[PDB]
Design an enzyme around this catalytic site. Sequence first.
Site, mmCIF file in Angstrom:
data_model
loop_
_atom_site.group_PDB
_atom_site.id
_atom_site.type_symbol
_atom_site.label_atom_id
_atom_site.label_comp_id
_atom_site.label_asym_id
_atom_site.label_seq_id
_atom_site.Cartn_x
_atom_site.Cartn_y
_atom_site.Cartn_z
ATOM 1 N N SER A 131 4.798 1.558 8.364
ATOM 2 C CA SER A 131 4.254 0.981 6.892
ATOM 3 C C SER A 131 5.002 0.090 5.916
ATOM 4 O O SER A 131 6.127 1.212 6.357
ATOM 5 C CB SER A 131 2.763 0.950 6.177
ATOM 6 N N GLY A 169 3.302 5.732 8.835
ATOM 7 C CA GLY A 169 4.848 5.733 8.551
ATOM 8 C C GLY A 169 5.875 4.809 8.844
ATOM 9 O O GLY A 169 6.546 4.203 7.750
ATOM 10 N N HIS A 211 0.952 -0.977 0.064
ATOM 11 C CA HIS A 211 0.164 -0.184 0.182
ATOM 12 C C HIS A 211 0.752 1.150 -0.061
ATOM 13 O O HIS A 211 0.447 2.243 0.034
ATOM 14 C CB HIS A 211 -1.136 0.270 1.470
ATOM 15 N N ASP A 250 -0.677 -7.561 1.556
ATOM 16 C CA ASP A 250 -0.128 -5.886 1.223
ATOM 17 C C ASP A 250 1.472 -6.062 1.385
ATOM 18 O O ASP A 250 2.242 -6.765 2.193
ATOM 19 C CB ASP A 250 -0.176 -5.344 2.888
ATOM 20 N N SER A 255 2.367 -4.256 8.042
ATOM 21 C CA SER A 255 0.814 -3.683 7.309
ATOM 22 C C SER A 255 -0.056 -2.276 7.613
ATOM 23 O O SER A 255 -0.070 -1.114 7.492
ATOM 24 C CB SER A 255 0.151 -4.827 7.056
#
Length: 198
Positions: free
Chosen positions: A143, A141, A36, A63, A159
């Site tokens: 992620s 952030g 993502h 993801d 994720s």
Amino acid sequence: ANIVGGIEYSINNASLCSVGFSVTRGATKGFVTAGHCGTVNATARIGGAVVGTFAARVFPGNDRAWVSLTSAQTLLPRVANGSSFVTVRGSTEAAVGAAVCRSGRTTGYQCGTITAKNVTANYAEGAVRGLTQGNACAGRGDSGGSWITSAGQAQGVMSGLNVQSNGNNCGIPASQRSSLFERLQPILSQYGLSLVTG
């Protein structure tokens, strides 16, 4: 740039995410990250410089993504922990109850335990299935960043989490957090990546 798990990179001069792990695909260098975070061919940058572009991703459903780097980049078997490093020794997937830490540019390096596997997160875009849940805190952030045991075994990439109004879930007790990562093994077989280790 030196590629180390946990550091900040931008996507198309706009969103931020964190590096997951250095990998190779034959002669191409790259790092795995959260799907993502960018779309195919989006431009990734570290410290103002272009390091590579998104080569493939799957989000939602799954993801995951990997960014192919130029030859100038220096892949390292390390995940950042403050000013120090955790060496990546392999990808043995840890079991529920195992203690685990994660690294990212927003909350830094945080540890906790794997609380559940095969969780579905329902994000605005659609569901993402098969995620593992731990209770180490994290913030927007983070992620894409590394989840790794103190012992050097890479678990996956960040994720999502139950975000609170402060942008992270570090202010509520560990019992209440649901921080989720995408397991690493499926990302590595899917794209034929080999993890860089030391």
